[PDB]
Amino acid sequence: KKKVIIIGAGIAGLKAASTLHQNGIQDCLVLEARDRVGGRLQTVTGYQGRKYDIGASWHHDTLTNPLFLEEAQLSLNDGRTRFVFDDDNFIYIDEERGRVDHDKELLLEIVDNEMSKFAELEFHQHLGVSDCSFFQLVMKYLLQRRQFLTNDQIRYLPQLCRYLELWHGLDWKLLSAKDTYFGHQGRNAFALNYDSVVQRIAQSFPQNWLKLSCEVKSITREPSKNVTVNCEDGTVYNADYVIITVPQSVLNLSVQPEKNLRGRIEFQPPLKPVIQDAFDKIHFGALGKVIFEFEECCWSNESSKIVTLANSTNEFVEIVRNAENLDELDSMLERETSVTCWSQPLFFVNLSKSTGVASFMMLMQAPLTNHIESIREDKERLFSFFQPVLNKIMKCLDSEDVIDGMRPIENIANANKPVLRNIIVSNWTRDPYSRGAYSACFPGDDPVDMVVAMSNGQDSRIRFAGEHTIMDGAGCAYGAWESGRREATRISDLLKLEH
Amino acid sequence: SPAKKKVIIIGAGIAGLKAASTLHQNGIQDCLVLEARDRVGGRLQTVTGYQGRKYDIGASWHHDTLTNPLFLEEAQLSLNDGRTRFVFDDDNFIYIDEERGRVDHDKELLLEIVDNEMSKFAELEFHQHLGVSDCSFFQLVMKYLLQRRQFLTNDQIRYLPQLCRYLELWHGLDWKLLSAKDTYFGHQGRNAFALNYDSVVQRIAQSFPQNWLKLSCEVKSITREPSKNVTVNCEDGTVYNADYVIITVPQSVLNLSVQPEKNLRGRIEFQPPLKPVIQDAFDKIHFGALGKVIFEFEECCWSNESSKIVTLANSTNEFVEIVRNAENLDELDSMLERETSVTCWSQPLFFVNLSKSTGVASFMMLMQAPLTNHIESIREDKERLFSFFQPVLNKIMKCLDSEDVIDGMRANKPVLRNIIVSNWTRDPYSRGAYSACFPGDDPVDMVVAMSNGQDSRIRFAGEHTIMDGAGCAYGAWESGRREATRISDLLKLE
Ligand SMILES: Cc1cc2nc3c(=O)[nH]c(=O)nc-3n(C[C@H](O)[C@H](O)[C@H](O)COP(=O)(O)OP(=O)(O)OC[C@H]3O[C@@H](n4cnc5c(N)ncnc54)[C@H](O)[C@@H]3O)c2cc1C
Ligand SMILES: Cc1cc2nc3c(=O)[nH]c(=O)nc-3n(C[C@H](O)[C@H](O)[C@H](O)COP(=O)(O)OP(=O)(O)OC[C@H]3O[C@@H](n4cnc5c(N)ncnc54)[C@H](O)[C@@H]3O)c2cc1C
């Protein structure tokens, strides 16, 4: 009945669909478990109708990002604003000291930069002589260059350098040192509606292809030459080619016990060892977001990029200055509970400077993400948890402590203080169809394995797409976008030529 | 007749000095170090100015401190003796335009950010891609502005190209004379300003026999007697015989050997003449002209926010318009040809505010070719030099919170006392600053031909003879250790 069956309506699947149609292919489906398309691309609506991407937000690597370039071309022709370049000079804030960025005496940006070259040198042409954690790597550096670092640099640099946790959605003790640093192919463009991208692509093929709320439970590959696919409601579709775009975290269920897990797909035959071993190669991080909606901007718009540093100690400096080796240090750190807003770095996007909106989009990482998404409906607790970083920010930005206005209550002498009107939090680590943000690396991981395993397919019939099945743009919206065109063309020409 | 020697080293720069040090280290004797100037150090020279203030008029920094074998050694000493030999002086750059004043870390221009994107663009352009032609740095920037114009503001298109040019002060070349392929190179970590590089020179010089050193002897020729012997002739008539010789004269001096006329100061006559691999290599690598000008002030009466300051060369909104309307690089080159004298604003200038990094109320300024040649040529006319750098000097004071500079070369106003100027381009045993690439140059040819010697006995060392640390003091050093080690080993097999 069906030529190709695309599982998942994220951008990978939506692209694969747009293409198949672009190549005259007919009778193809798109089975999406959620009741909406977009997958990890979702724009929501808050106070006074403001819109925010709770999922993906940027076009990364604008110098090579092909999806972005398509968008740029569209904007050249119709003048419609689709994105904005929000790269800015980062403001770094420490609870006690305050702003530690562009410091005439701390010069953290320079050492961080060195820190970066050091890491490159440690793994350059070595085959990864034992991979450690970003945390360990940072320690090695501090030890090896202390003779050339002041006290304040040994104390703060490691905290500032953790902003990289918000790029992987992983804390520095869980993240791989070998993958921490990666290529940044040019500036980033804040998408002004990734939902426009999702919207455009979904409307580039027969709407009657989309089947929302279709949980796919099992995929069968009868050597006969067809592929049996059964959604959850008991329906069944027969197809020649199948493009599975579910997320790595989800797919990683097909290789475990308990087939009653939400989303899990039963494969018949079972995924060859290559694929199943790929999963031991690690994956899935947990980048999260909290949107803070204020009545109006009443703070300085010096920068659109603000990062709060996790608390540090002079007791740390002393331990670096006295350790005699990695072992004595790796141990002398036996020094030392209660997670607070100052227990990890937090990345704040000041939307006022960049998009004229009085809100802040904050990014968070594991293990914090899952705990905060857990209390997403408890506005009061969320406000109490972040109130201190928020006020520290407002202070540093020539403003005042935040007033809680989420409950409809109007006052007048508060037109000079920032009034918080609402909080929106993501829910990716708890949504069964995502179970996390995107692929990431634990010390010892190796992405190539999975990319190859995935791009080589289960066979000539069962293929794969998604931010986890490609090398360029891995984990990014465009990476997923291209992986969708890939499998799509590999099946397309393989049909036009047929007959 | 000619005194016998095991090894003869030509040149007492850091290369020859280290090569000799290594030799005396591996127990070799009857060696000689022939140097044309009345001093050792070569391109490393510390001079004296107002009040006894000292400055390096040649090399100043230890580059790539994460892997600099020379630096590491220096830092090891300071770990014991506890004395200060250097100071990490990297800092956030302050960029100054004539009209607009400071343009660094500006929330609207974000120049440093687009600058970062441009180098990435350059990396994506040549890295991994074979066959791509070379072109000039200037051409590379124009191409970038062309391809990314839809994503840049008018002021970025205007100021970025001028901000990118600080790289001219890393090569000693104007962006039109500089090879795009060689413009960007890795920096293995922070830089360390040596507080007197002469202390490095001295320490190495004193690590071997004094009698080994012969200053003021200008070597004029080297000959290979096809039978384990090399003849060297100082101009003072003396003649020496050696088993080995390590030639360390600058690439620019050595270049004089492949041309007819033996009466040029520094030129060495080779018999047999240098092999064609060596000769032909001079066509694929050239020489840069980085220069220095020291501005000594009475006292420091200016802001010490940073020790790094770069004055941008003038730009015009007309340029932005041309970039906006150009159809391609072809039309842009055409429109750009929109045609008077050279001023302190005709090219970027790089100033080191020594006040902040050393406490000394002076400015160390770097310049590039062609400006360096014109400035060093009139380096004796102190009045003309002040009139030249006055507008720019003032502007700095303004941006740094102070008044115009006062000429005091004979309360809250900065008073200029002395102006020192480098002389590397006019010096016969220098003839320029250091190895550099014009578009098309393949530096590997020279490095290969050099480290493989003229033959088993005629060897070469110097900053232009090695890959890692090429053009650097520590590379010259390593090349010195290289040649000496090889020889020791050979002289060890008796
Ligand atoms: C907080 C956060 C921020 C991010 N920010 C950025 C950014 O700034 N820039 C960037 O480039 N990328 C960003 N990303 C990553 C980007 O969102 C993803 O790479 C991309 O959306 C993945 O697309 P996909 O099509 O592969 O998968 P989705 O993850 O799009 O998966 C496709 C669909 O599969 C469906 N599905 C799953 N299981 C089943 C099943 N059993 N049956 C049927 N359907 C099923 C899902 O419900 C989903 O809709 C971010 C991600 C997160 C979580
Ligand atoms: C203005 C300027 C700034 C610089 N700044 C830096 C910096 O910040 N950091 C850095 O790492 N590098 C810097 N350099 C480069 C550094 O100075 C050189 O890499 C290094 O000093 C070259 O050493 P060398 O031993 O090869 O040659 P020298 O240049 O050491 O040459 C060797 C010797 O040969 C002698 N000689 C020449 N001809 C004859 C002859 N016929 N007979 C006898 N002797 C002869 C010369 O007098 C000279 O002393 C700078 C150079 C210049 C010009």
Domain containing A37: what range? 1-84+189-282+433-499
Instruction: Provide CB contacts within 8 A for A193, sequence distance 6+.
Output: A43, A51, A53, A82
Tokens of B116: 């970062």
Nearest ligand 2 atom, CA B424: 53
- Residue written as tokens 């809680």? A404
Domain boundary among A377, A411, A432: A432
Both A227 and A254 in one domain: the answer is: yes
Say how far apart CA B426 and CA B288 lie, in whole Å. Answer: 13
- Write a three-state SS string for chain B: CCEEEEEEEECCEHHHHHHHHHHHHCCCCCEEEECCCCCCECCCCEEECHHHCEEECCCCEECCCCCCHHHHHHHHHHHHCCCCCEECCCCCCEEEECCCEECCCCCCCCHHHHHHHHHHHHHHHHCCCCCCCCCEHHHHHHHHHHHHHHHCCHHHHHHHHHHHHHHHHHHCECCCCCEHHHHCCCCCCCCEEECCCHHHHHHHHCCCCHHHEECCCCEEEEEEECCCEEEEEECCCCEEEEEEEEECCCHHHHHHHHCCCCCCCCCCEEECCCCHHHHHHCCCCEEECCEEEEEEECCCCCCCCCCEEEECCCCCHHHHHHHHHCCCHHHHHHHHCCCCCCCCCCCCEEEEEHHHHHCCCEEEEEECECHHHHHHHCCCCHHHHHHHHHHHHHHHHHHCCCCCCEECCCCCCCEEEEEEECCCCCCCCCCCCEEECCCCCCHHHHHHHHHCCCCCCEEECCCCCCCCCCCCHHHHHHHHHHHHHHHHHHHHCC
Tokens of A179: 């993958």
Q: Chain B within 8 Å of A312 (Cβ-Cβ)? A: no
Both B308 and B448 in one domain: the answer is: no
Burial label, B341 (beta-carbon count in 10 A; 0-12, 13-18, 19+): exposed
Say how far apart CA B399 and CA B387 lie, in whole Å. Answer: 20
Both B220 and B360 in one domain: the answer is: no
Cα-to-centroid distance, B73 and ligand 1 (Å):
52
Tokens of A82: 């689709």
Neighbours of B141 (CB within 10 A): 21
Q: Tell me whether the omega of the peptide bond preceding residue A418 falls within 30 degrees of 0, making it cis.
A: no
Q: Chain B within 8 Å of A85 (Cβ-Cβ)? A: yes
Cα-to-centroid distance, B429 and ligand 2 (Å):
9
Q: Strand A236-244 vs strand B269-271: parallel, antiparallel, or unpaired?
A: unpaired
Q: Chain A within 8 Å of B121 (Cβ-Cβ)? A: yes
Contact call for residues B371 and B342 (beta carbons, < 8 A): yes
Neighbours of A96 (CB within 10 A): 9
Please work out whether the CB of residue A55 comes within 6 Å of at least one atom of ligand 1.
yes
The last residues before gaps in chain A (C-N over 2.5 Å) are 336
Say how far apart CA A275 and CA A294 lie, in whole Å. Answer: 47
Say how far apart CA B464 and CA B455 lie, in whole Å. Answer: 18
Let me know how long chain A is.
499
Tokens of A495: 């049909």
Q: Report in angstroms the alpha-carbon separations of B134 from A229, B334, B337, B375, B437.
A: 55, 20, 21, 30, 11
Say how far apart CA B197 and CA B85 lie, in whole Å. Answer: 8
Tokens of A53: 């991407």
Neighbours of A296 (CB within 10 A): 12
Annotate B268-300 with b (16+ C-beta within 10 A) or e (fewer): bebeeebbeebeebbebbbbbbbbbbbbbbbeb
The DSSP 8-state label assigned to residue A376 in this structure reads: T
- Residue written as tokens 């004071």? B397
Backbone dihedral angles phi then psi of residue A64, each to the nearest 5 degrees? -125, -20
- The CA-based angle B278-B280-B283, given to 5 degrees, is 120
Contact call for residues B167 and B312 (beta carbons, < 8 A): no
Cα-to-centroid distance, A193 and ligand 1 (Å):
16
Contact call for residues A415 and A399 (beta carbons, < 8 A): no
Instruction: Provide CB contacts within 8 A for B478, sequence distance 6+.
Output: B18, B69, B70, B466, B468, B469
Which one of A87, A107, A121 has the shortest CB-CB distance to B91?
A107
Tokens of B423: 């002389």
Picking from B429, B482, B421, the residue whose alpha carbon sits closest to that of residue B215 is B429
Both A3 and A113 in one domain: the answer is: no
Instruction: Provide CB contacts within 8 A for B27, sequence distance 6+.
Output: B488
* A230 Cα to chain B: minimum distance (Å): 46
Q: Give the three-state DSSP class for A58.
A: strand
Please work out whether the CB of residue A344 comes within 6 Å of at least one atom of ligand 1.
no
Both A289 and A335 in one domain: the answer is: yes
Which ligand neighbours the alpha carbon of A86 most closely? Answer: 1
56-75 in chain B: CB under 8 A from chain A = 65-67, 75
Residue A267 host element (H or E): strand A266-268
Q: Note the Cα A401 to chain centre separation in Å.
A: 30
The one-letter amino acid code at A47 reads Y
Cα-to-centroid distance, B180 and ligand 2 (Å):
25
Say how far apart CA A42 and CA A53 lie, in whole Å. Answer: 6
Picking from A184, A185, A168, A166, the residue whose alpha carbon sits closest to that of residue A176 is A168
A64, closest residue in chain B (CA to CA)? B124
CATH number of A162's domain: 3.90.660.10
Helix spans in A170-272 (H)? 177-180, 194-202, 248-251
Both B187 and B246 in one domain: the answer is: no
Q: At what angle do helices B111-126 and B137-148 cross, to 10 degrees?
A: 110
Tokens of B250: 């600058």
Say how far apart CA A280 and CA B371 lie, in whole Å. Answer: 61
Say how far apart CA B181 and CA B159 lie, in whole Å. Answer: 22
- Residue written as tokens 């995502």? A434
Instruction: Provide CB contacts within 8 A for A339, sequence distance 6+.
Output: A368, A371
Please work out whether the CB of residue B232 comes within 6 Å of at least one atom of ligand 2.
no
Contact at CB, B105 and A87, closer than 8 angstroms: no
Cα-to-centroid distance, B273 and ligand 2 (Å):
24
Neighbours of A207 (CB within 10 A): 7
Q: How many CA atoms lie within 13 A of A197 on its CB side?
A: 32
Which residues of chain A make contact with B90, given a CB cutoff of 8 A? 107, 110
Both A265 and A374 in one domain: the answer is: no
Say how far apart CA A264 and CA A258 lie, in whole Å. Answer: 9
Neighbours of B455 (CB within 10 A): 12
The one-letter amino acid code at A214 reads C
- The CA-based angle A215-A216-A221, given to 5 degrees, is 175
Specify whether the backbone of B154 is left (phi greater than 0), alpha (psi in -120 to 50) or beta. alpha
Say how far apart CA A67 and CA A76 lie, in whole Å. Answer: 15
Q: Strand B239-247 vs strand B269-271: parallel, antiparallel, or unpaired?
A: unpaired
The DSSP 8-state label assigned to residue A168 in this structure reads: H
Say how far apart CA A428 and CA A370 lie, in whole Å. Answer: 8
Both B168 and B308 in one domain: the answer is: yes
Picking from B22, B422, B12, the residue whose alpha carbon sits closest to that of residue B218 is B12
Annotate A440-451 with b (16+ C-beta within 10 A) or e (fewer): bbbbbbbbebbb
Out of A29, A31, A40, A214, mutate this one to test ligand 1's pocket (max ligand atoms within 8 Å of CB): namely A40
Both B143 and B256 in one domain: the answer is: no
Tokens of A169: 């959605």
The DSSP 8-state label assigned to residue A153 in this structure reads: H
Q: Report in angstroms the alpha-carbon separations of B234 from A22, B2, B11, B256, B268.
A: 81, 11, 12, 17, 10
The DSSP 8-state label assigned to residue A235 in this structure reads: -
Nearest ligand 1 atom, CA A11: 25
Q: Report in angstroms the alpha-carbon separations of A39 from A45, A96, A433.
A: 17, 40, 8
Tokens of B192: 């360390």
Q: How many CA atoms lie within 13 A of A352 on its CB side?
A: 19
Both B179 and B301 in one domain: the answer is: yes
List the single best residue of B93, B94, B151 to mutate versus A (max A Cβ within 10 A).
B151
- Dihedral sign, Cα of residue A53, residue A56, residue A62, residue A67: negative
Say how far apart CA A409 and CA B286 lie, in whole Å. Answer: 75
Tokens of B114: 């687009």
B142-146 own/partner pairs: CB under 8 Å, 24+ apart: B142/B323, B142/B329, B142/B332, B142/B333, B142/B336, B143/B329, B144/B118, B145/B323, B146/B323, B146/B326, B146/B328, B146/B329, B146/B332
The DSSP 8-state label assigned to residue A247 in this structure reads: -
Resolution of the coordinates in A?
2.5
Domain boundary among A432, A456, A487: A432
Contact call for residues A171 and A165 (beta carbons, < 8 A): yes
Strand partners, B214: B34
Please work out whether the CB of residue A285 comes within 6 Å of at least one atom of ligand 1.
no
A122, closest residue in chain B (CA to CA)? B66
Say how far apart CA B385 and CA B373 lie, in whole Å. Answer: 13
Picking from A169, A176, A193, A202, the residue whose alpha carbon sits closest to that of residue A426 is A169
Helix spans in A433-476 (H)? 447-455
The one-letter amino acid code at B48 reads T
Backbone dihedral angles phi then psi of residue B418, each to the nearest 5 degrees? -130, 150
Out of A210, A218, A246, A430, mutate this one to test ligand 1's pocket (max ligand atoms within 8 Å of CB): namely A246
Tokens of A297: 């901007």
Contact at CB, A107 and B92, closer than 8 angstroms: yes
Cα radius of gyration rounded to whole Å, chain A: 24
- Residue written as tokens 């302190």? B344
Number of helices and strands (H, E) in chain A?
17, 21
Residue A211 host element (H or E): strand A210-212
Strand partners, A52: A44
Q: Report in angstroms the alpha-carbon separations of A258 from A203, A253, A255, A266, B346.
A: 37, 9, 10, 10, 74
Q: Tell me whether the omega of the peptide bond preceding residue B348 falls within 30 degrees of 0, making it cis.
A: no
Contact call for residues A314 and A130 (beta carbons, < 8 A): no
Say how far apart CA A306 and CA A86 lie, in whole Å. Answer: 12
CATH number of A32's domain: 3.50.50.60
Both B233 and B155 in one domain: the answer is: no
Q: Strand B291-297 vs strand B415-421: parallel, antiparallel, or unpaired?
A: antiparallel
181-200 in chain A: CB under 8 A from chain B = 184-187
Say how far apart CA B17 and CA B22 lie, in whole Å. Answer: 9
* A397 Cα to chain B: minimum distance (Å): 14
* B189 Cα to chain A: minimum distance (Å): 5
Both A298 and A393 in one domain: the answer is: yes
Cα-to-centroid distance, B401 and ligand 2 (Å):
38
The one-letter amino acid code at B74 reads E
Annotate B229-254 with b (16+ C-beta within 10 A) or e (fewer): ebbbbbeeeeebebbbbbbbbbbbbb
- Which residue owns the Cα nearest ligand 1 atom 7? A56
Out of A214, A438, A450, A485, mutate this one to test ligand 1's pocket (max ligand atoms within 8 Å of CB): namely A438
Which ligand neighbours the alpha carbon of A52 most closely? Answer: 1
The one-letter amino acid code at A290 reads V
- Write a three-state SS string for A279-291: HHHCCCCCCEEEE
Q: How many CA atoms lie within 13 A of B251 on its CB side?
A: 31
- The CA-based angle B48-B53-B57, given to 5 degrees, is 50
Q: Count the domains in chain A.
A: 2
Q: Report in angstroms the alpha-carbon separations of B447 from B284, B432, B443, B452.
A: 11, 19, 6, 9
Q: Which experimental approach was used here?
A: X-ray
Say how far apart CA B234 and CA B316 lie, in whole Å. Answer: 55
- Which residue owns the Cα nearest ligand 1 atom 26? A466
Nearest ligand 2 atom, CA B461: 26
Give Dmax (Cα) for chain A.
76
Q: Tell me the residue ranges of DSSP E strands in A302-401.
A: 305-309, 346-350, 359-364
Backbone dihedral angles phi then psi of residue A434, each to the nearest 5 degrees? -135, -45
Say how far apart CA A161 and CA B34 lie, in whole Å. Answer: 51
Q: Report in angstroms the alpha-carbon separations of A439 from A287, A445, B265.
A: 10, 11, 66
Residue A216 host element (H or E): strand A216-220
Say how far apart CA A157 and CA A177 lie, in whole Å. Answer: 16
* B162 Cα to chain A: minimum distance (Å): 20
Cα-to-centroid distance, A21 and ligand 1 (Å):
22
Q: At what angle do helices B329-336 and B317-325 cross, to 10 degrees?
A: 150
Q: Report in angstroms the alpha-carbon separations of A69 from A75, A198, A484, B133, B479.
A: 10, 15, 17, 26, 48
DSSP codes joined into one string, A110-150: HHHHHHHHHHHHHHTTTT-SS--BHHHHHHHHHHHHGGGS-
Which one of A64, A110, A118 has the shortest CB-CB distance to B66?
A118
Domain boundary among A414, A432, A450: A432
Nearest ligand 2 atom, CA B463: 26
Cα-to-centroid distance, A480 and ligand 1 (Å):
8
Picking from A467, A494, A495, the residue whose alpha carbon sits closest to that of residue A483 is A467
Contact call for residues B199 and B56 (beta carbons, < 8 A): no
Tokens of A373: 């998404």
Burial label, B135 (beta-carbon count in 10 A; 0-12, 13-18, 19+): middle
CA dihedral A242, A245, A250, A255 (to 10 degrees): 40
Say how far apart CA B213 and CA B197 lie, in whole Å. Answer: 20
Nearest ligand 1 atom, CA A39: 49
- The CA-based angle B97-B99-B104, given to 5 degrees, is 35
Picking from A388, A384, A347, A371, the residue whose alpha carbon sits closest to that of residue A425 is A371
Which ligand neighbours the alpha carbon of A433 most closely? Answer: 1
